[PDB]
């Protein structure tokens, strides 16, 4: 038994069926020790009395919130939450596995430049009693840097029965003294809480890896006199990191075999939809949504 | 004022089937697990198995294991205890007990169904 | 499963007397063990858990103890109410299990 927050306690339990309890031991958070009883969650029934009392924690039955009372009034609580282990792997049930890189990446992370703000957001199926929790950090090393803000709703892309519900949360790490490279991975820890359950994930990465930059800013032509040559020239994203030249893109120019991949901010191609994409130079990072231009 | 009160008493012929129910009462029944427990013909008690009233998060004793089924419509605070074919070794007494939380024991008790099966 | 085991199968005792009945398990079953009483066609009452532990409501006149693997019941004064025949649960590892009874006959 473990605390989470201040009066938030996790219980962790394998579920082989010859396995036993854990026998816990819950103090009240008070001073005087005299007549006391406790209670559990909405239930007016006393389950024993002195400052302290001892239970076992088996089932989801024996989870949630023991309040110590005296005379009448309330005086502390426990919750308990439990952490069920299946068999040697933790329970993953809230968090949908949406196997698109790897496997088991329940977590995703992306971000628009080199700035240290990015973004990650889970899938689920759940819509209640559902509370998160976000920490960072890049290395064991300065504990500081990253912090993160609140998991927020983000979606509803229903589905065949259950409807999906996505949660997203913003990060910015913050370095006392920015290093030109990247040594050691960015990692994410969530919480997960529902209603009595609790779960935890986490992923790790490069910043140099999950990158997805805007589209291309803004396109333009040029057919001149009579000759039908589009071209077609644009600048680059707002929010890409600067200078351009220490972070340079690459693009990729399209329509509706042919396509034309290069590096200057400019080129032109053949008349008859018009598009470009944009990536980071250097890695086979995530291409950029497409920018659309007439014929 | 907890009340565990059970379905009367039933007589079969082996091979047909049988739900028996335990409507609770007096006591905030989405708080306490239930469970069922069989005692034959002047015999002990068998541990048959414990179960949630919210979610089905149900626990056979291996033994009942796929024998009996277990179940609870919270709308009514009623548990229910079934079998699809009955033997003669059927034929005890079914109490439906209440699961003391943070313990795991038997809280109150059922006022027992008596069960025949005899052709 | 654990094997739960009373003794004596019985016994017989008057009004007032001090007596005990024991409880072994196969095993450890930690301090888990609860104790029912039960009479003829009536459903057991539920009287001690966690081994020395009285459920809100039974008489001041129970106790148990033991932990581990032996435990007890005792009555301090009998009285009349109190013949039944009398069982133990672990209620430690699945499935609980109970013991085979013990039977509390007046001596007369």
């Known amino acids: 038994i473990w605390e989470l927050k201040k009066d938030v306690y996790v219980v962790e339990l394998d579920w082989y069926p010859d396995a036993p309890g854990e026998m816990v031991v819950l103090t009240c958070d008070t001073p005087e020790e005299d007549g006391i009883t406790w209670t559990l969650d909405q239930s007016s029934e006393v389950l024993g009395s002195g400052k302290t009392l001892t239970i076992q924690v088996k089932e989801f039955g024996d989870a949630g919130q023991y309040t110590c009372h005296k005379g009448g009034e309330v005086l502390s609580h426990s919750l308990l939450l439990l952490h069920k282990k299946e068999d040697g792997i933790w329970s993953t049930d809230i968090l949908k596995d949406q196997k698109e890189p790897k496997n088991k990446t329940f977590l995703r992370c992306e971000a628009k430049n080199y700035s240290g703000r990015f973004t990650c957001w889970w899938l689920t199926t759940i819509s209640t009693d559902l509370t998160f929790s976000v920490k960072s950090s890049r290395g064991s090393s300065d504990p500081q840097g990253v912090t993160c803000g609140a998991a927020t709703l983000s979606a509803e892309r229903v589905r065949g029965d259950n409807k999906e519900y996505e949660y997203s949360v913003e990060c910015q790490e913050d370095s006392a003294c920015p290093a030109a490279e990247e040594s050691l991975p960015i990692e994410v820890m969530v919480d997960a809480v529902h209603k009595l359950k609790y779960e935890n994930y986490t992923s790790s990465f490069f910043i140099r890896d999950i990158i997805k930059p805007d589209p291309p800013k803004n396109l333009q032509l040029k057919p001149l006199k009579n000759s039908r040559q589009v071209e077609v020239s644009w600048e680059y994203p707002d929010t890409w990191s600067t200078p351009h030249s220490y972070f340079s893109l690459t693009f990729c120019v399209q329509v509706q075999k042919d396509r034309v991949f290069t590096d200057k901010t400019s080129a032109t191609v053949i008349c008859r939809s018009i598009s470009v994409r944009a990536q980071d130079r250097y890695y086979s990072s995530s291409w950029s949504e497409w920018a659309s231009v007439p014929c | 004022e907890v009340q565990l009160v059970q379905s009367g008493a039933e007589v079969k012929k082996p091979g047909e089937s049988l739900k028996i129910s335990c409507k609770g009462s007096?006591?905030?029944?989405?708080?306490?697990?239930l469970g069922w427990v069989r005692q034959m013909p002047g015999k002990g008690l068998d541990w048959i198995g414990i179960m949630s009233p919210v979610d089905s998060d149900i626990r056979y004793s291996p033994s009942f294991q796929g024998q009996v089924t277990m179940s609870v419509d919270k709308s009514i605070t009623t548990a229910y205890l079934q079998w699809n074919s009955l033997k003669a070794s059927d034929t005890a007494m079914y109490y439906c007990?209440?699961?003391?939380?943070?313990?795991?024991?038997?809280?109150?008790w059922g006022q027992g169904t008596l069960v025949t099966v005899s052709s | 499963d654990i094997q739960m085991t009373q003794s004596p199968s019985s016994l017989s005792a008057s009004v007032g007397d001090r007596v005990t009945i024991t409880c072994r398990a196969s095993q450890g079953i930690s301090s888990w063990l609860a104790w029912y009483q039960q009479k003829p066609e009536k459903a057991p009452k539920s009287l001690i858990y966690?081994?020395?532990s009285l459920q809100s409501g039974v008489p001041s006149r129970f106790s148990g103890s033991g932990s581990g693997t032996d435990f007890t019941l005792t009555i301090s004064s009998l009285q009349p109410e109190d013949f039944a025949t009398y069982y133990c649960?672990?209620?430690?590892?699945?499935?609980?299990?109970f013991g085979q009874g013990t039977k509390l006959e007046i001596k007369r």
């Open positions: 007096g006591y905030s029944f989405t708080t306490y697990w």
């Open positions: 966690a081994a020395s």
């Open positions: 649960q672990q209620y430690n590892i699945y499935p609980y299990t």
């Open positions: 007990a209440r699961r003391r939380p943070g313990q795991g024991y038997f809280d109150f």
